[PDB]
Design a protein around this nucleic acid. Structure first.
Ligand SMILES: [Mg+2]
Ligand SMILES: [Mg+2]
Ligand SMILES: [Mg+2]
Ligand SMILES: [Mg+2]
Ligand SMILES: [Mg+2]
Ligand SMILES: [Mg+2]
Ligand SMILES: [Mg+2]
Ligand SMILES: [Mg+2]
Ligand SMILES: [Mg+2]
Ligand SMILES: [Mg+2]
Ligand SMILES: [Zn+2]
Lengths: 115, 121, 177, 84
RNA sequence: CCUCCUAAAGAGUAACGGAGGAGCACGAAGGUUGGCUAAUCCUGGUCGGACAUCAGGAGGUUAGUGCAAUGGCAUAAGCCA
RNA sequence: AAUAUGCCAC
RNA sequence: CGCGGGGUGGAGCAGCCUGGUAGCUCGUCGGGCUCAUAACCCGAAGAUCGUCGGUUCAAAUCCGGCCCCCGCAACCA
RNA sequence: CCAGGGCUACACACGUGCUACAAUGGCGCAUACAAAGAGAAGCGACCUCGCGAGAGCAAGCGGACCUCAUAAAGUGCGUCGUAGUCCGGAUUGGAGUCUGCAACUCGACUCCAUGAAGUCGGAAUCGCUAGUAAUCGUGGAUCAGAAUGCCACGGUGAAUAC
């Protein structure tokens, strides 16, 4: 119930639980379970410690949690200090993939700031 | 009073004059004519049928095209009136759209350069 | 006392050979280990301080002292005598027990652990390190953690200088970086 | 982005300028309009004035811009903020 | 009514002279026994900062004295039990 | 039950 | 000049006399109803308290002055 | 006439829509039922490869013949068990496919990862009385690529009108 250094829920099925690892979604969770030979509908608190060890080994293959976080952070910071268009967009906290900013863009710009 | 106590609308302290550009857009010598009429506003004679408080404190200064239609929406900010927008219109009575734009520019000027003009100016 | 024996049998020899100390008694020891948590949220709910002290008791095997305000501060809305933290001091046997537990269990459980800083020697040879989460200690049960109580740990040492202090700590396989 | 079968895209005139400038040493900044061109590995150290609609923004090419369009480092819009 | 100065190195000494306080508090803030020593700053440290708790150092009583000011106070009259 | 006003040639 | 007060959002007032935190109305802003405006309806922001310096762990509040605004008094010859 | 840029800018405000806020649902597996349209530097089978966008060879067809092109909602079983959740999909990182001289400004799409706001929305306000509303998919024009728009097509299918 502690894979890649984080607590994962014991009450949920294995596929749903493994998605709690920052870096594993449904697809990677299914791949991990298949490679470790564990049913997709089994609940975490009902796996043998050997099975959890194998799961640890599998999830160790992929970059997750802190390593992934700092990888993403160094990619963003490289964009930043290069100061290309995407670096400038990231600095200003505006949409980065060519969306419209005349309206919407609330996810990047934050909620309404009245004048 | 000093023949030039006009202030043209800027959106901010260094905001590119949003009135001088909309005024340079005004075709041909209408610009010089309207400058003359502003001088006449500081003279105190500018003739009848030329000025009108449209709604709010917004005064339309008028010139020509059909019947006095080279229109300029301004408002009095103390001794020195502020010229908001300048625009060509065809039908009589400035379109509501342009009126509402003038009102918004009035409010923006108030929140930028001040609500009431300085004590001595 | 496992690490105490390891100290007296190997760490002393390393330090003697390394710093050429003329006397064996010149080798640094570990005076005390202080675990503190400033429950500045107790001023609202006093019970929070009791629960945090329960967590510290679980970590340390040792009932904590309820440290109170030294002087009334209005910037934090504390009056003189208000209890605002709990601390424990560990020496000798329980020193070494907690020390080994920390190094060989709790530090590995730290989320995204990359290496403890070597800049946390306070100019004399005392190591102060901050633990953000009390879940890294298995003594605390995760499922009842009502709130992320952190703490800060001070290894107080007879070293005169940071160089000697960090050499002593590293000889204990301490995870610097 | 560009399909990998087609490889990278460099405009021929900019490639000519770059190869001649690199083989003949440090020279004047490469005044160029090919914003759509790719920064190749042998681009390092060159200062290139990439057009942006009215100006030729100078860009000192370094290692970490390899694989990026030169037009990305020459922004084409001006913005300082509303009612600052 | 209390404290300092004027007040002229014993006491005392006036002015519609210059500054401040009191009309209480406490069953413990009293007695005794045992114990302890401050302000401030710097360094390190989870949330947590200029100021919260922890550790070390410099410092030296620049703190404290239930309330004014003076005189005291380390043997403590200051702080715990 | 309350329901004020409408200036720019035509 | 003496004595009693007062200085609080853009305006008018509370709060403060019992030091632990600043509210009301109008106004302003945004939207709504209207062909449009007024009225009206629905949301929001706004003052860190005249000012200096103290006290206090904490000052709009307590204190001392200083600045300005009112009120009473400035008499007997 | 030409190359670059802009029409794609963003403190904000309004209109019109799309997806949601879940269990009348989500996901997984199997499976039934359509109409209408398009197509010749065009639609592109079958087969092989790729996890997928798609790639290779390549028939057939200006067509009631071939392709687009397995409709989806629905039904059967399991699962989730009311939680900001296997809801929800914004945003962002990495890796890629196609078109096009060229995808930085400024394309669509795919894989992995991230997983936001949102728990039914104030005053106010809109559409609709039938196969209509609601809901589910499909096609076309424009077009090298580029629809949640527009124009059509069918599937399921009500309440109410004193
Ligand atoms: Mg007309
Ligand atoms: Mg005397
Ligand atoms: Mg004498
Ligand atoms: Mg006493
Ligand atoms: Mg005593
Ligand atoms: Mg457009
Ligand atoms: Mg989902
Ligand atoms: Mg078509
Ligand atoms: Mg098309
Ligand atoms: Mg239909
Ligand atoms: Zn191990």
């Amino acid at each position: 119930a502690r894979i890649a250094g984080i607590n994962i829920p014991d009450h949920k099925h294995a596929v749903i639980a493994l998605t709690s690892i920052y870096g594993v979604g449904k697809t990677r969770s299914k791949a991990i379970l298949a490679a470790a030979g564990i049913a997709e509908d089994v609940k975490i608190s009902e796996l043998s410690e050997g099975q959890i060890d194998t799961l640890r080994d599998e999830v160790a293959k992929f970059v997750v949690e802190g390593d992934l976080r700092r990888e993403i952070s160094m990619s963003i910071k490289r964009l930043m200090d290069l100061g290309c268009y995407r670096g400038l967009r990231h600095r200003r906290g505006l949409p980065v993939r060519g969306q419209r900013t005349k309206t919407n863009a609330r996810t990047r710009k934050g909620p309404r700031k009245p004048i | 009073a000093a023949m030039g106590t006009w202030k043209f609308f800027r959106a901010s302290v260094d905001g590119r004059p949003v009135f001088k550009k909309e005024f340079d857009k005004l075709p041909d010598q209408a610009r010089a004519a309207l400058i003359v009429l502003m001088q006449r506003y500081l003279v105190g004679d500018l003739a009848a049928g030329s000025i009108k408080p449209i709604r709010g404190d917004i005064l339309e200064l008028r010139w020509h095209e059909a019947n006095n239609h080279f229109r300029v929406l301004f408002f009095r900010w103390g001794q020195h009136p502020v010229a908001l927008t300048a625009f060509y219109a065809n039908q009589q009575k400035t379109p509501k759209t342009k009126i509402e734009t003038a009102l918004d520019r009035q409010k923006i000027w108030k929140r930028a350069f001040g609500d009431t003009p300085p004590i001595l100016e | 006392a496992k690490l105490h024996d390891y100290y007296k049998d190997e760490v002393v020899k390393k330090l003697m050979t390394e710093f050429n100390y003329n006397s064996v008694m010149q080798v640094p020891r570990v005076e005390k280990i202080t675990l503190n948590m400033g429950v500045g949220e107790a001023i609202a709910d006093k019970k929070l301080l009791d629960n945090a002290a329960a967590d510290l008791a679980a970590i340390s095997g040792q009932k904590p002292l309820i440290t109170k305000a030294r002087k009334s501060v209005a910037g934090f809305k504390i009056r003189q005598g208000y209890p605002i933290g709990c601390k424990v001091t560990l020496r000798g046997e329980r020193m070494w027990e907690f020390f080994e537990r920390l190094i060989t269990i709790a530090v590995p459980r730290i989320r995204d652990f990359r290496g403890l800083s070597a800049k946390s020697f306070d100019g004399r040879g005392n190591y102060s390190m901050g633990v953000r989460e009390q879940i890294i200690f298995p003594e605390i049960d995760y499922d009842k953690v009502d709130r992320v109580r952190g703490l800060d740990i001070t290894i107080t040492t007879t070293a005169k200088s940071d160089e000697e202090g960090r050499a002593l700590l590293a000889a204990f396989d301490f995870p610097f970086r | 982005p560009r399909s990998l079968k087609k490889g990278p895209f460099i405009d021929l005139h900019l490639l000519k300028k770059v190869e001649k400038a690199v083989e003949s040493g440090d020279k004047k900044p490469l005044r160029t309009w090919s914003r759509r061109s790719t920064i190749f590995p042998n681009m390092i150290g060159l200062t290139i004035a990439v057009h942006n609609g009215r100006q030729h923004v100078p860009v000192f090419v370094t290692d970490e811009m390899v694989g990026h369009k030169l037009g990305e480092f020459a922004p084409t819009r001006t913005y300082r903020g509303h009612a600052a």
